[PDB]
Amino acid sequence: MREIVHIQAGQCGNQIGAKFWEVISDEHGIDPTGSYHGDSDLQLERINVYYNEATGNKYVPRAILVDLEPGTMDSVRSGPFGQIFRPDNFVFGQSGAGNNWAKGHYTEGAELVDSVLDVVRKESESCDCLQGFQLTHSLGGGTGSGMGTLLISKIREEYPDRIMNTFSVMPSPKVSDTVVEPYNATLSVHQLVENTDETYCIDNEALYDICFRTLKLTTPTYGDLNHLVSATMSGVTTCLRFPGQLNADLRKLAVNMVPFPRLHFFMPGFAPLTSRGSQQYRALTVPELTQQMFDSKNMMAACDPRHGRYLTVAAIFRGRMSMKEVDEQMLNVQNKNSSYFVEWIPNNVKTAVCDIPPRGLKMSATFIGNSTAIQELFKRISEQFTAMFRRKAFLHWYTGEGMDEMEFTEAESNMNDLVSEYQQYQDAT
Amino acid sequence: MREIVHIQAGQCGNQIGAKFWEVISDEHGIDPTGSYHGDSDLQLERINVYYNEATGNKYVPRAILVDLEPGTMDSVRSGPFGQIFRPDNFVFGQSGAGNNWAKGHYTEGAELVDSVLDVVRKESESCDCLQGFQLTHSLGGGTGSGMGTLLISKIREEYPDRIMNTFSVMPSPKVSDTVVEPYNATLSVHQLVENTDETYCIDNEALYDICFRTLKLTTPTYGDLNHLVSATMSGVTTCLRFPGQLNADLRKLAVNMVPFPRLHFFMPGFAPLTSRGSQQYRALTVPELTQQMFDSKNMMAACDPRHGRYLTVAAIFRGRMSMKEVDEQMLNVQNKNSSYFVEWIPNNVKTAVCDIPPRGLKMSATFIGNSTAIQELFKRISEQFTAMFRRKAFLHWYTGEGMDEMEFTEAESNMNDLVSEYQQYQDAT
Amino acid sequence: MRECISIHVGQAGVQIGNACWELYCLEHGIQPDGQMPSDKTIGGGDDSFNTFFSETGAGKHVPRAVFVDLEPTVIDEVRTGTYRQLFHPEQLITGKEDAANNYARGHYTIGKEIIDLVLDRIRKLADQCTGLQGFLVFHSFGGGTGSGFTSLLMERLSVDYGKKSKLEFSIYPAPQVSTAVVEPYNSILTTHTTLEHSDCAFMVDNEAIYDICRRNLDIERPTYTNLNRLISQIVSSITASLRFDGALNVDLTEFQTNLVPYPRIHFPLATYAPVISAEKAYHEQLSVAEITNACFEPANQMVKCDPRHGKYMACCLLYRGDVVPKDVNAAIATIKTKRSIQFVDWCPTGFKVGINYQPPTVVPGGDLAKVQRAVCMLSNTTAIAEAWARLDHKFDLMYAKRAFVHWYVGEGMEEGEFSEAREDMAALEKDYEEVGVDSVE
Ligand SMILES: CC(=O)O[C@H]1C(=O)[C@@]2(C)[C@H]([C@H](OC(=O)c3ccccc3)[C@]3(O)C[C@H](OC(=O)[C@H](O)[C@@H](NC(=O)c4ccccc4)c4ccccc4)C(C)=C1C3(C)C)[C@]1(OC(C)=O)CO[C@@H]1C[C@@H]2O
Ligand SMILES: CC(=O)O[C@H]1C(=O)[C@@]2(C)[C@H]([C@H](OC(=O)c3ccccc3)[C@]3(O)C[C@H](OC(=O)[C@H](O)[C@@H](NC(=O)c4ccccc4)c4ccccc4)C(C)=C1C3(C)C)[C@]1(OC(C)=O)CO[C@@H]1C[C@@H]2O
Ligand SMILES: Nc1nc2c(ncn2[C@@H]2O[C@H](COP(=O)(O)OP(=O)(O)OP(=O)(O)O)[C@@H](O)[C@H]2O)c(=O)[nH]1
Ligand SMILES: Nc1nc2c(ncn2[C@@H]2O[C@H](COP(=O)(O)OP(=O)(O)O)[C@@H](O)[C@H]2O)c(=O)[nH]1
Ligand SMILES: Nc1nc2c(ncn2[C@@H]2O[C@H](COP(=O)(O)OP(=O)(O)O)[C@@H](O)[C@H]2O)c(=O)[nH]1
Ligand SMILES: [Mg+2]
Known part of the structure; x- marks a missing residue:
């Protein structure tokens, strides 16, 4: 019951999920080969949320790996965790995406999506009672953006009532490593609006900032930033897999995170984050963890909450903890900072408490915020977009691939309308 | 006195009876070899109802095994209970039946029935005072349907006043495992009308439903479903073999179960059915057993009694029980559910009470119902029949074997007339 | 039975x-x-x-x-x-x-x-x-x-x-x-x-x-x-x-x-009087008289409420254990004496006592100690309207902007049903405004 299909898409999608199924595969004591080597029978009661048991107690995930380039697949196969996936789930083309949206959504994506939805139906027809899906992908890539939004817009036609959420990486102007990532991000924000139930917006600068300031790292790679992100994605569905005192599925969050439809862009947050060495000097508690979660410097989205108001938040704690301290800390926050909350919603916070912490510490927590300050993201992109597009730069690589202008102007307007949706719900009483 | 000749016919017939003479052979403490190893002299007073005592206290049943295929016979011989039968009673041909009615009733059945009625007269000429016969067979097979109804229609010419009853398995549309089972079932319903004294209609879906819901089994085979059915067939003739407080032969049921001739199609029911583990959580009592015998989910016929009215029922209890609780429970039922009974019959229920429960528990019971809701069976077949026959599909394998069309149209009309016999006796005051 | x-x-x-x-x-x-x-x-x-x-x-x-x-x-x-x-x-x-x-x-x-x-x-x-x-x-x-x-x-x-x-x-x-x-x-x-x-x-x-x-x-x-x-x-x-x-x-x-x-x-609302920690269970005087007074405490309530803000309408004393009734009737008469406890003017005869002999059990690993007597007081009061005013106001805030409406309508109910259940609860809170008030002539 309550299975989750994992569709990691693109290059970025595969890197995160590579590290994602290295965490989950530790949560449940899965061997690299696929056998089970746990001790506690909590690890197995709800293993089936992610893993198909196969013949002779091997555990094959329900993940589908999609790419338009053979490379990432060959890396994953040849690595520590190649053994863990089913080889019919490594679905990939040959001709690269171009870091071009048109090329992954119309030309070379449509060719492949038939051979992938046929793998979605291998997974969906085997489940007892499916709950949801998930992309892991990148707004700013070819396959992450384009092919991802082709997969999504073809699942709503098949499975129109399952919680489909994305962990999408969004561009930041301070750190650019692709010239047309405004073009590629604009045309996919357009698709995520109408098609998705929850969207966890993650940036790059926000992850260095955690590494530098909080964790006291020296030299971060993609390897390190997605290792964080995977500890968030584990937290989301903890109460789906572990027993808790308050439970919270995918659907439970969705329901009371999202005031209006369409405003389904969340800001995660993790706590605790210490350096090694500076762990014997923080006392690890619930007021300690709450103060980090309401800190700006522990947002994995490169914004400051202080430039708006949280509509709603959720607080997912993992550990042997109290309920008074939880119910109090979550109270003392929305009193002391009552101008940082939307006031037409009483009790902006939802708490959930699991019983099972991560496999090195006690008392973690995970903050998921629906803040109005996320329009700071959508405007920084729609300024770069409108500065290139007024010249019509880089246009022939897009009109060459089946698109035209009128897909742009509408997609620019769909991004600029929801800036005026966070804006309405920040102010006006 | 009051002997019963057992004619298990076909493949299905042999499987049930294999398991049937594993129960009876436990009721009377018969060794696999055929010696007696009981302790109570109740087991021997009426052993002769089923068993010929042979030379030197071995006990050979009065069963005749008929087949058109050597296989089932070789299985039974080579099994645990091969020793128990007399080897002159394993009567079988070589050429298979085809799951064809014509092939078992005219061509290859008629050839063999001479060598079988000569075995019927070995058994019938040895009995003190014969009571009855019994087929165990399958409406939907070649030998169960065809050869069975050839044996029946040739016994009424010899023994025209013995209670001949069948435990016939009837097809269900939810579970099909033969394409022309409408053809094979239609042409044998035709013979069971005019020739039989009681007919215990049993289905497949009704037996999974007992396994899944009530018994809490996992993975049923034919082995498991007929193990149930044999616990019904033991119950029928309990008071014929054991002493009781109310007695009840084959003839006693027949007489006050059957308002009109021709309406001799009964719905069995057994109680109790618990899983192991869920036995220390039911209190085992007469109101406990009564509620199982009238619940729809404990019918071995895939119907709901609520789609009609019981004409008559019989309630055959086996155990050290009271008579007030029996006489009351059977009263409180036909008061509270007075619209579920035909009202032109007072006291729709006949009780019989034996003294001897099965060899694991106290206080079993057996429900045998003459419900009007059995036309749900005859119509679901006469819809499949009339959908194939309008094309004349699969016709040359039947007209090839000595039949013709006019045997079909009449046999379809004999089934469709008795739908209008259960219909008349449901409604109309 | x-x-x-x-x-x-x-x-x-x-x-x-x-x-x-x-x-x-x-x-x-x-x-x-x-x-x-x-x-x-x-x-x-x-x-x-x-x-x-x-x-x-x-x-x-x-x-x-x-x-x-x-x-x-x-x-x-x-x-x-x-x-x-x-x-x-x-x-x-x-x-x-x-x-x-x-x-x-x-x-x-x-x-x-x-x-x-x-x-x-x-x-x-x-x-x-x-x-x-x-x-x-x-x-x-x-x-x-x-x-x-x-x-x-x-x-x-x-x-x-x-x-x-x-x-x-x-x-x-x-x-x-x-x-x-x-x-x-x-x-x-x-x-x-x-x-x-x-x-x-x-x-x-x-x-x-x-x-x-x-x-x-x-x-x-x-x-x-x-x-x-x-x-x-x-x-x-x-x-x-x-x-x-x-x-x-x-x-x-x-x-x-x-x-x-x-x-x-x-x-x-119910209460329960002998909520006492093991250490504080000595240094007890846990008589009938003290435990009856403890029921009428606005701090010992099971609801975020203060009966000093409304009037009681009935009470209902359910006692367990080592009990002599005349101790109770003398503790009632104290309760009737005090003017901090407002009954209504149409009650007159306060309330119903009930006694039972079976003493509670201390739940193993539980939070209570071993008490000899114990008292729930089930008690109608007009102060539970205050719990409602604090929650209608939270509903009336969110429903003013029709916030989470789209989840509910797309599941098998109507927008119309909010407006009926809000009127329905507003009528209850109007009943307790009209039941607290005596009639005069
Ligand atoms: C001696 C000791 O206690 O070591 C700790 C440790 O020093 C700390 C610093 C860890 C450590 O984490 C990091 O340095 C880090 C690296 C990349 C990305 C994110 C963090 C640790 O590496 C991570 C590791 O985490 C776990 O085991 C969790 O179960 C976690 N797992 C993974 O991310 C993972 C790591 C390696 C291999 C497989 C999985 C998790 C979190 C959320 C959801 C699922 C799993 C722990 C407790 C430690 C070390 C080992 C030093 C911290 O992180 C986490 C997520 O627990 C960083 O701040 C916390 C506080 C911990 O005390
Ligand atoms: C502790 C206790 O009371 O155990 C019971 C028991 O748990 C139950 C669950 C039994 C049990 O039956 C089964 O588990 C089963 C498995 C596969 C297919 C069919 C049945 C039992 O095995 C079977 C067994 O039946 C008998 O012994 C009867 O004499 C029975 N005999 C056989 O069919 C038989 C089984 C194995 C070998 C040889 C013969 C019988 C019933 C009616 C008429 C004549 C004979 C009984 C009562 C029990 C066990 C032992 C657990 C039940 O079955 C019968 C036929 O009685 C299943 O629902 C009933 C209700 C019983 O209460
Ligand atoms: N006394 C007590 N109250 C509880 C407990 N769990 C939740 N509550 C409260 O009851 C409400 C929650 O009911 P839920 O458990 O959320 O829901 P449910 O009715 O079981 O169904 P779902 O919403 O589908 O999970 C909240 O307002 C809580 O404050 C518990 O263990 N004990
Ligand atoms: N978080 C994250 N983003 C990535 C990673 N690799 C690429 N990206 C992002 O993905 C986009 C480029 O798409 P890419 O994955 O190269 O497309 P490909 O042709 O399908 O490999 C950019 O917006 C990058 O920031 C990664 O490892 N982690
Ligand atoms: N209940 C039951 N039905 C059976 C069994 N085996 C076959 N059948 C039924 O019998 C029909 C096939 O007839 P079959 O017995 O194979 O005829 P054969 O050629 O004489 O063996 C189908 O309708 C089946 O549902 C059995 O073991 N139990
Ligand atoms: Mg719940």
Whole structure:
């Protein structure tokens, strides 16, 4: 019951999920080969949320790996965790995406999506009672953006009532490593609006900032930033897999995170984050963890909450903890900072408490915020977009691939309308 | 006195009876070899109802095994209970039946029935005072349907006043495992009308439903479903073999179960059915057993009694029980559910009470119902029949074997007339 | 036989019942494997296990209770846990997805799929009863199953049965502490069946219990497990005079006759006086006189409320243990004396006492000590309107902008239903404004 299909898409999608199924595969004591080597029978009661048991107690995930380039697949196969996936789930083309949206959504994506939805139906027809899906992908890539939004817009036609959420990486102007990532991000924000139930917006600068300031790292790679992100994605569905005192599925969050439809862009947050060495000097508690979660410097989205108001938040704690301290800390926050909350919603916070912490510490927590300050993201992109597009730069690589202008102007307007949706719900009483 | 000749016919017939003479052979403490190893002299007073005592206290049943295929016979011989039968009673041909009615009733059945009625007269000429016969067979097979109804229609010419009853398995549309089972079932319903004294209609879906819901089994085979059915067939003739407080032969049921001739199609029911583990959580009592015998989910016929009215029922209890609780429970039922009974019959229920429960528990019971809701069976077949026959599909394998069309149209009309016999006796005051 | 039915709905409703059915196991001397031990060659339905325990043959006690959830997960804590063979297997009914804090899902979409299987469990327990007393629904206002399903059930229980008492043990939403943000949506919609179909709805909330644990009891850090042992002593005393001897016994129906003035004024809060920590249990004077005064304390309330803000309408003293009545009548007369305690002017004769001989049990690993006497005071007061004013205002805020409406409409209810259940609760709060006021001539 309550299975989750994992569709990691693109290059970025595969890197995160590579590290994602290295965490989950530790949560449940899965061997690299696929056998089970746990001790506690909590690890197995709800293993089936992610893993198909196969013949002779091997555990094959329900993940589908999609790419338009053979490379990432060959890396994953040849690595520590190649053994863990089913080889019919490594679905990939040959001709690269171009870091071009048109090329992954119309030309070379449509060719492949038939051979992938046929793998979605291998997974969906085997489940007892499916709950949801998930992309892991990148707004700013070819396959992450384009092919991802082709997969999504073809699942709503098949499975129109399952919680489909994305962990999408969004561009930041301070750190650019692709010239047309405004073009590629604009045309996919357009698709995520109408098609998705929850969207966890993650940036790059926000992850260095955690590494530098909080964790006291020296030299971060993609390897390190997605290792964080995977500890968030584990937290989301903890109460789906572990027993808790308050439970919270995918659907439970969705329901009371999202005031209006369409405003389904969340800001995660993790706590605790210490350096090694500076762990014997923080006392690890619930007021300690709450103060980090309401800190700006522990947002994995490169914004400051202080430039708006949280509509709603959720607080997912993992550990042997109290309920008074939880119910109090979550109270003392929305009193002391009552101008940082939307006031037409009483009790902006939802708490959930699991019983099972991560496999090195006690008392973690995970903050998921629906803040109005996320329009700071959508405007920084729609300024770069409108500065290139007024010249019509880089246009022939897009009109060459089946698109035209009128897909742009509408997609620019769909991004600029929801800036005026966070804006309405920040102010006006 | 009051002997019963057992004619298990076909493949299905042999499987049930294999398991049937594993129960009876436990009721009377018969060794696999055929010696007696009981302790109570109740087991021997009426052993002769089923068993010929042979030379030197071995006990050979009065069963005749008929087949058109050597296989089932070789299985039974080579099994645990091969020793128990007399080897002159394993009567079988070589050429298979085809799951064809014509092939078992005219061509290859008629050839063999001479060598079988000569075995019927070995058994019938040895009995003190014969009571009855019994087929165990399958409406939907070649030998169960065809050869069975050839044996029946040739016994009424010899023994025209013995209670001949069948435990016939009837097809269900939810579970099909033969394409022309409408053809094979239609042409044998035709013979069971005019020739039989009681007919215990049993289905497949009704037996999974007992396994899944009530018994809490996992993975049923034919082995498991007929193990149930044999616990019904033991119950029928309990008071014929054991002493009781109310007695009840084959003839006693027949007489006050059957308002009109021709309406001799009964719905069995057994109680109790618990899983192991869920036995220390039911209190085992007469109101406990009564509620199982009238619940729809404990019918071995895939119907709901609520789609009609019981004409008559019989309630055959086996155990050290009271008579007030029996006489009351059977009263409180036909008061509270007075619209579920035909009202032109007072006291729709006949009780019989034996003294001897099965060899694991106290206080079993057996429900045998003459419900009007059995036309749900005859119509679901006469819809499949009339959908194939309008094309004349699969016709040359039947007209090839000595039949013709006019045997079909009449046999379809004999089934469709008795739908209008259960219909008349449901409604109309 | 004075038999009664527990129904435990949703996560909160199940997890209370663990703490209920832990207790009765100790009350009647029953092992978690349903067995009375060998030192009970005394009278069993004379100790009257037979209101909560159908005695299976061969000395085995299984409740008359049904554990219902739309989610598989909660009850699976009861399978195993330690209660894995206390319960009948067929009275632990699981769905596959919960209502997910959505009333429309618990009442229309998901709830209907298991509602007939649950009503059929009721009949299997209803037909085993001789002298059925009524039902005890446990839930929380502000779940999906606790609100949506309970609303669906209480409709069906009113139609099939009618005549019997149907008690509720709700958890009311707390004014500051809340964990769902649509918590007020699910409370307005459960208003409908709570006033109409229930015969007596109790309300508790978590903050008023946090106070008692921390202050009277010196527990640093309560969890749900700690609060529900407290809840269970209130219910254990309610239903104790059905099932033990005492002078002035009180059936389930003698509450309603003595507690409830008018049709829909049936929301009495409970208290419980001897909430005392082990150390503070010496340095006691825990007489009848002190424990009667402690009931009338605005701090010892189970609801975030202050009876100094309204008038009592009835009270109802249910005592257990080493009790001499004249001590009680002399403690009543003190209560009538004080003018800080406002009864209404149409009550005159204050309230109903009831005594029972069976002393409570100390729950092992539990939070209380060993007390000799114990008192719930079920008591109608006009101060529970204040709990409502603090929650209508949260509903009226969110529904002013039609916030979470799109989830609810797309699940099997209307926009129109919010406007009816808001009027419905506004009329209750108008009844308590008009029931507090005396008439003059
Ligand atoms: C001696 C000791 O206690 O070591 C700790 C440790 O020093 C700390 C610093 C860890 C450590 O984490 C990091 O340095 C880090 C690296 C990349 C990305 C994110 C963090 C640790 O590496 C991570 C590791 O985490 C776990 O085991 C969790 O279960 C976690 N797992 C993974 O991310 C993972 C790591 C390696 C291999 C496989 C999985 C998790 C979190 C959320 C959801 C699922 C799993 C722990 C407790 C530690 C070390 C090992 C030093 C911390 O992180 C986490 C997520 O627990 C960083 O701040 C916390 C506080 C811990 O005390
Ligand atoms: C502790 C206790 O009471 O155990 C029971 C038991 O648990 C139950 C569950 C039994 C049990 O049956 C099965 O588990 C089963 C498995 C596969 C297929 C069919 C049945 C039992 O095995 C079977 C067994 O039946 C008998 O012994 C009868 O004499 C029965 N005999 C056989 O069919 C038989 C089985 C194995 C070998 C040889 C013969 C019988 C019933 C009616 C008429 C004549 C005979 C019984 C009562 C039990 C066990 C032992 C657990 C039940 O079955 C029967 C036929 O009685 C299943 O539902 C009933 C209700 C019983 O209470
Ligand atoms: N006393 C007590 N109260 C609880 C407990 N769990 C939750 N509550 C409260 O009851 C409400 C929640 O009911 P839920 O468990 O959320 O829901 P449900 O009715 O079981 O169904 P879902 O919404 O589908 O999970 C909240 O407002 C809580 O404050 C518990 O263990 N004990
Ligand atoms: N978080 C994250 N983003 C990545 C990673 N690799 C690429 N990206 C992002 O993905 C986009 C480029 O798409 P890419 O994955 O190269 O497309 P490909 O042709 O399908 O490999 C950019 O917006 C990058 O920031 C990664 O490892 N982690
Ligand atoms: N109940 C039951 N039905 C059976 C069994 N085996 C075959 N059948 C039924 O019998 C029909 C096939 O006839 P069969 O017995 O194979 O004829 P054969 O050629 O004489 O063996 C189908 O309708 C089946 O449902 C059995 O073991 N039990
Ligand atoms: Mg729940």
